[PDB]
Curated annotation (Swiss-Prot), chains A, B, C, D:
Annotated consequence of substituting T211A: Decreases affinity for phospho-AI-2
Coiled-coil residues: none
InterPro entries: NagB/RpiA_transferase-like (IPR037171), SorC_transcr_regulators (IPR051054), Sugar-bd_dom_put (IPR007324), WH-like_DNA-bd_sf (IPR036388)
Record comment regarding domains: Contains an N-terminal DNA-binding domain and a C-terminal ligand-binding domain, connected by a linker region.
Keywords (A to Z) from UniProt: Activator, Cytoplasm, DNA-binding, Repressor, Transcription, Transcription regulation
One GO term of the biological process aspect: DNA-templated transcription
Activity regulation info: Inactivated by phosphorylated autoinducer-2 (phospho-AI-2). Phospho-AI-2 acts by binding to LsrR, which is then unable to bind to the promoter regions, allowing the transcription of the target genes. Phospho-AI-2 triggers the disassembly of the tetramer into dimers and reduces the DNA binding ability of LsrR. Dihydroxyacetone phosphate (DHAP) may act as an anti-inducer and inhibit binding of phospho-AI-2 to LsrR, preventing induction of transcription of the lsr operon.
Major site of localization recorded for this protein: cytoplasm
Induction: Autorepressed. Part of the lsrRK operon, which is positively regulated by cyclic AMP-cyclic AMP receptor protein (cAMP-CRP) in the absence of glucose and negatively regulated by LsrR.
Family: Belongs to the SorC transcriptional regulatory family.
Organism: Escherichia coli (strain K12)
Protein name according to UniProt: Transcriptional regulator LsrR
Quaternary data: Homotetramer. Dimer of dimers. Interaction with phospho-AI-2 triggers the disassembly of the tetramer into dimers.
Length: 308, 308, 308, 308
């Protein structure tokens, strides 16, 4: 280095590029690093958080679809990002979701989170903010491993309450037992007294591409029984119908270690981050059941939700 | 024999050899002796005691304890660092361990880790290595959160396999049940397959400053009775006598989720990083039982370990 | 215009550009606009205020202050490091200047040094650099022992030219005699030919904490009269008022063995390294008089230098 | 590095080489360093002090010559090193003088030193010891620069009092003035209260090879007038004749800033380190004058001294 950590190098290049408008080359020899190191870092900055880009306009998202999704479902916060065929769904939403959370979260506040590419991608772009604002995290469901992608790529000086059990027990009785263990029971309480919550939303229409199945928490065959039973999607493993009600005919619901949906309702602000048109139905059903009262999605999915 | 006796000749060559740095041949003709005679005398020199090379450094004490620990205990690898004599004794324990682990772990191997301050502090310095060499990590016991300050300070793209359950269950039965959940059992098998293991060692003489007791896994009353029943130290919750034998009449043991010390021994290389004179007896017993076969400790402790 | 107005188009391209990282051309056809129209709107974006890039780091403030000091005072090189908010303000001031000196000194060049804690602390980090690049050192004033903590921490095969006399003489006449001894006058000439100069800056408001007074070159009684006479700070024993003018009615000046501030100015690059909010006044004055044209300081001091 | 400083790497190789007898190659791979870096450090160790070689024999030096030099001149300590034609004389003596001082010096004691290659080479071999034993240093004469070869190559945490003036003034008036400045006067007192003293010895017979002249402290022309005026050699600038008496007819003696020979005798142990056959006369004279009561020289000069 040059007596300065990378963080300071990013800020120095960010400053020369944006505030002094210098070619990514002029600043190469200016800071004493290869033309390739320069640009390497610039991108490093945006991805990290050091470099924040502000779009001050009511058109940051899809203004119309937002106003409509807001009224139709009575949502306290809604963000519909511009569509872009063929792209990581969760990676784009994560960006949007991060920004939204950066304005609803107050210093030293509790943030409940659920697994999935959508939320874990948000956690990643939200790492920086969690540090400074000193946000405390707490997992809404069991699983552990399924949370590593998000909390892992974070600072080690942050408070992260992790439910110490699997996401699903082999039997309903074993689930009751673990929920009574002090280590578990403790975090379930912690989770329910959270200020903001961020969860994903799975669809039964996703078949074998649903994070729930490709992670091995539910079998392909069990998925069928669930669809047949009239279920559209899920949240943390709890499945519901197109009207927004938990199908109380599914075996898994009593083997899930982790706050049941009725209990998640206690969190003031509940953000759902999901995209894709095959989710359109499950997302509408989650806003119906009142499981979420804020939503981060993409244009296509917004159109699909509003249409049907 | 230019009027010189052997003793004088020996001192003459020793001076020229070490203080003047002359080749054993340059000294041959300088003293009027055959090149074969000069070398024989130099040899005689050390053999007699006339010539003695002594290492003038604090590190010498460490080197010494390293060989005595290697002789007395059958240790494959040993590393003794300066004691309280120098700054930050605990901090340096992690640096040492981290480097011993770097010379033992090959690209893409499996590393089983234990909880504790020494293990997590070591785990952090080893962040760099773990990423660059694609090391895989697996937790030896339950606890989940107990590992966060270490794996938390790590790369997110790296494989980290954790046991999704408490460190301890409320009863031996609930423990046995948890040990049979596939999501749990999977990681216990993975654990035993590790190539290298890194663990800390707790001491009963540590009283309440003990991490096992400070973290609330064991009550002060339990720790006193454990000490009464002959235990002197512990590794992952399993207590043993100064002989090295796991104490049998201890309830906590069957309530522990995680590999028993016996299985731990299947791992080829087992590194124990522990410092502080109060751990002397326990560390010693840990080796007599064969729980570890590699040790990283500080000068003062080594002294005590070898004393008694 | 796919039904979109300017403001909405700008937000859309801004989103694709920064949050999705698409080429100025890939978003050209995505929005159905000419490749030249795309870039035109992006430009308009920042120029309007709809698009704003802000650096989220503690270092932001520093770069800000570096800019302001640069404009307000004629500074060739400036470095502002975080203040007391961060650990070791004094320690880090040495690191900074050390690096500033490394980008200014070419192999085999002459470096004139002043005494003081900041200068000696800087002179120590720069030990590596001085050797490897064959830097020559020369002292700006008498004191001899006053430099040992710095040059002492250096290689012995390095060229170090020291003034063979006291920092201050008992009378103006003894000083003038000493300044005439060839063995002395020679180091004074060499000092004036240096390429780079590094000095500290004392403040009268430092009272008894001032290095000049702690080292016993000046009595408390003299310091008070000097302040009473308009002096705000000093460099190498020569005092000056807030304007930058060397105070003339001060007796100590004509007793000083060593180059006068005026001669210091012949040195191309003059770097002053000073931290601590109480030197603010003096530092500022040192620049208004042009005794230094490069500055390395802390955030808080910079702030105060700029306030008043 | 391998997590260990160089000091620790030297001790590890010294240990393998001498206490475990392993080829300079087998220890290359053992510490993970180039076969060339191994040997680099090995000899780096001897040079520094970390590797001390002990020669426990009455013949470490030239026994006969020492017993004779001791008795004829009544010396407290005497060391005569083995002769070796064509060699850095001061560099060999330095090793000898070093070891002698290491046994004469008790912790925290003050050592007065004079300039010259002999003393400066001793100071360099003594650096290590001066640090641990925490020996305080003080210059017997002015000069400052002429002492940098020795004190420079030392740690920066040790006490070193330096007479802040030239070795010689341009006039006797100027010389008395300097000897009366508080900072000079003080060090002169510190000098006289020293426990041990180590100085060199110049000989008139050295012509233009005498450090006294090749450093420009005295003109070769002035040298002759001193020779003709009947002087054999000098110590710190003070000239004397074959019998051991200061020629009171020399002008320089009154222009020298620094403890006069008379004052130098106040110091308990006064070791003179000098070699070469052309000094044999000057050295003998200094022992008769009583200036030194200890001597470290080499075999040939020893015989030279005893012959005439
Ligand atoms: O990866 P994603 O599809 O965005 O997330 C879907 C999962 O997270 C949701 O809350 C449901 O529990 C699903 O299992
Ligand atoms: O924090 P430390 O004292 O270094 O670690 C001691 C604990 O970790 C060890 O593996 C044992 O399980 C102890 O309970
Ligand atoms: O120790 P510091 O306060 O940083 O240095 C200030 C002193 O050194 C400066 O050149 C001035 O001569 C002061 O006497
Ligand atoms: O470098 P060396 O010849 O060994 O030292 C000789 C000098 O030091 C002696 O005390 C005399 O003062 C000479 O000036």
């Amino acid at each position: 280095e040059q007596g300065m950590c990378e963080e300071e190098q990013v800020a120095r290049i960010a400053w020369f590029y944006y505030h002094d408008g210098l070619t990514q080359s002029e600043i190469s020899d200016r800071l004493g690093l290869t033309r390739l190191k320069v640009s390497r870092l610039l991108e490093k900055g945006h991805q990290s958080g050091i470099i924040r880009v502000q779009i001050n306009s009511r058109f940051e998202g899809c203004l119309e679809y937002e106003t409509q999704l807001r009224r139709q479902f009575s949502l306290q916060h809604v963000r519909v990002i511009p569509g872009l065929a063929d792209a990581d769904v969760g990676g784009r939403l994560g960006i949007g979701a991060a920004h939204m959370l950066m304005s609803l979260l107050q210093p030293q506040q509790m943030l409940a989170i659920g697994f999935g590419e959508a939320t874990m991608n948000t956690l990643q772009r939200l790492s920086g903010f969690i540090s400074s604002q000193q946000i405390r995290l707490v997992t809404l469901s069991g699983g552990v491993g399924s949370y590593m992608t998000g909390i892992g790529q974070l600072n080690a000086a942050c408070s992260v309450n992790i439910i110490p059990a699997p996401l699903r027990a082999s039997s309903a009785d074993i689930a009751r037992t673990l929920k009574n263990e002090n280590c578990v029971k403790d975090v379930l309480l912690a989770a329910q007294a959270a200020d903001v919550a961020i969860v994903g939303i799975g669809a039964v229409s996703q078949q074998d591409d649903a994070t729930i199945i490709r992670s091995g928490y539910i079998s392909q065959g069990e998925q069928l029984m669930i669809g047949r039973k009239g279920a559209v999607g899920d949240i943390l493993g709890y499945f519901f119908d197109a009207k927004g009600d938990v199908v109380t005919n599914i075996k898994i619901h009593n083997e899930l270690i982790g706050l049941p949906l009725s209990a998640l309702k206690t969190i003031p602000v509940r953000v759902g981050v999901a995209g894709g048109e095959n989710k359109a139905e499950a997302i509408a059903a989650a806003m119906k059941g009142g499981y979420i009262n804020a939503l981060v999605t993409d244009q296509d999915t917004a159109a699909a939700i509003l249409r049907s």
